[PDB]
């Protein structure tokens, strides 16, 4: 896989990594989600990523708690760039491109 995602812990230490091998990565409480979090403050889809030969696009489905990127909310769709970090409440995922 070219795209790799690293999990950030509440303590600020990186742990297990998630390879975005699949063309779609969905974060949330829903099981159908590629990444599931057992937090009651997490939306069913929270964040959705779509990977196109062109580039990687992150969609914000969290209407209750918007996803933050580079320390900023993404009310609208945003193209992912190598080095861009997705931040969820107290948890964030570092995006690495190849």
């Amino acid at each position: 896989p070219t795209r790799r995602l690293v999990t950030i812990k509440r303590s600020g230490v990186d742990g297990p990594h998630f390879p975005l091998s699949l063309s779609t990565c969905l974060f949330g409480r829903g099981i159908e989600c590629d990444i599931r979090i057992q937090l009651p403050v997490v939306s069913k889809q929270h964040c959705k990523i779509e990977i196109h030969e062109q580039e990687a696009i992150l969609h914000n489905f969290s209407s209750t708690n918007p996803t933050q990127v580079n320390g900023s909310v993404i009310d609208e769709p945003v193209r992912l760039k190598h080095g861009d970090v997705i931040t969820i409440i107290d948890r964030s995922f570092r995006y690495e491109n190849e």
Binding site: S11, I37, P40, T64
Partner: protein, 40 residues
């Protein structure tokens, strides 16, 4: 909480509890609260 229940917005109380919880936790965090659907 069911993956099909309510979704309360994260507030100052929730964030403070997590920070406290981290202090109450240790290297045992290893088993945080994130689950990977696909293999890693």
């Amino acid at each position: 909480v069911d993956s099909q229940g309510p979704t309360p917005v994260c507030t100052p109380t929730f964030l403070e509890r997590r920070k406290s919880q981290v202090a109450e936790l240790n290297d045992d965090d290893k088993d945080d609260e994130i689950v990977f659907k696909q293999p890693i």
